[model samples]
Target: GSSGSSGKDYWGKFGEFCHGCSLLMTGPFMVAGEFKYHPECFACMSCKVIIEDGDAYALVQHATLYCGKCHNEVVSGPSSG
Candidate 1:
């Protein structure tokens, strides 16, 4: 697909899990037909459900923005020091 002439940039976040890794939180504009899934299952309760022991819809109920923010801050912190 053509990278259209839009000013918006969709930044990608990454995560790893036992099943596989996830490339996540990828959207702001709908790139129709083009699809990607975030593998950071622990980040999405629904994602966590699909591969684990829990209700699928309940995953959405617990979703939060700071989901992995703590880890990001922690990992970035030691590198800069």
Candidate 2:
């Protein structure tokens, strides 16, 4: 089997769910943005998300329910389109 096997190919799909809601934590692959965020994951010295809401949430660990947006985008895209 063949795989793209390129680091660039993996970045487009790198984000996770908002800590509280389903809103995705996303930005450009790199350049000017971080990896991912969640509803609760606000932008901080280490974290970075525009504070739309007043409260801030801590970053959760890597788990099934909490994965990056890239996973979602790829799953949603047409398999062969």
Candidate 3:
């Protein structure tokens, strides 16, 4: 009777395609969920800071990425983290 529910986890992996350019990234890059991009390609959709440094960021449904400081702005209606 090993049929039971436990642990929430994400499995498997997709390609190294960049959502920003809609192309395969075979060089230096970063990933946000299903999205992948190079340093400059990972520019925040809000602020101009790229993800290669000071590296905290967030990505949204449109693959609309933003710097971590701007996360709350994207989630303007939420009460807590």
Candidate 4:
């Protein structure tokens, strides 16, 4: 049988890779540091809201991402104390 190419090809540049699906993102995306996420992927870890421009978010510990509302309600809210 003829062996086929079985690795990353030039198509990798056509789109950003999605952290959520671990696949290529060929749609609108949001970037943070070295991570790229599709609109559906750019969600708040706390409330699960889809983050967008004009929305405030925080990348806690350089690991998790959260929307401002949840961040304030969870990280700095009264219960956080």
Candidate 5:
């Protein structure tokens, strides 16, 4: 019996990892740019709201998430005195 390289490595064909949670997507998922994410996992960091495919979402700093409303605030800054 030969015992060597018993694992199959075919993940390169479909390696859709959740962009937000960094978890492997096994079920329903969404695509943002070149990244894949769970529909419920694509979130707004402002209040942790779940963003669906067509929902109003805005990516901030190219590093954060903000729902449409929050994204507006992010651009405007804190309310004036």
Candidate 6:
């Protein structure tokens, strides 16, 4: 009868929209303040280096994320005011 065989589709959703591309996330993601982003998208604003979990990073103005090297070199550089 009707119980012989059944098939159903299963969909899973996780994480939040990427701050860089504004797209749905399925895997590892990063969060800063009220922002969310995919691992590939959450990168240093100065050098475009991708930041991984546990890696040193800095957030500025609640909008930008930078790697430790770039942050110190760019944000705290001699020309910075």
With candidate 3 superimposed using the best TM-score fit, by how many Å does residue 8's alpha carbon deviate from the native? 38
lDDT of 5 by residue, 14-52 (tens): 566666555567788876545677888778876888888
Error of 4 at 22 (Å): 0.9
Name the best candidate (by lDDT). 4
How does candidate 6 score on lDDT?
0.70
**For every model shown, what is its TM-score relative to the native structure?**
0.15, 0.19, 0.54, 0.64, 0.63, 0.62
Error of 1 at 42 (Å): 7.7
Compared with the true structure, what per-residue lDDT tens digits does model 1 show for residues 1-81? Answer: 667543332453343212223233543211111332343233332223332223222112222322233335434755765
Model 6 over residues 1-81: C-alpha lDDT tens digits?
A: 356654332343353567566566677777765778787777778788777888888877756677877677557666746
Candidate that scores best on TM-score? 4
Position 8, candidate 6: lDDT: 31
Worst 10 residues of 2 by lDDT: 28-37
Candidate 1 residue pairs in clash (backbone atoms < 3 Å): 22-39, 45-59, 46-59
The best-first sequence of candidates by TM-score reads: 4, 5, 6, 3, 2, 1
Candidate-wise lDDT, in order:
0.31, 0.38, 0.65, 0.73, 0.71, 0.70
- After TM-score superposition, what is the CA distance of residue 80 in candidate 1 from its true location, in Å? 10
In model 6, the Cα lDDT at residue 61 comes to: 72
Minimal lDDT window, size 10, model 4: 5-14
Q: Report the lDDT of model 3 for residue 10.
A: 43
Can you rank all candidates by lDDT, best first?
Answer: 4, 5, 6, 3, 2, 1
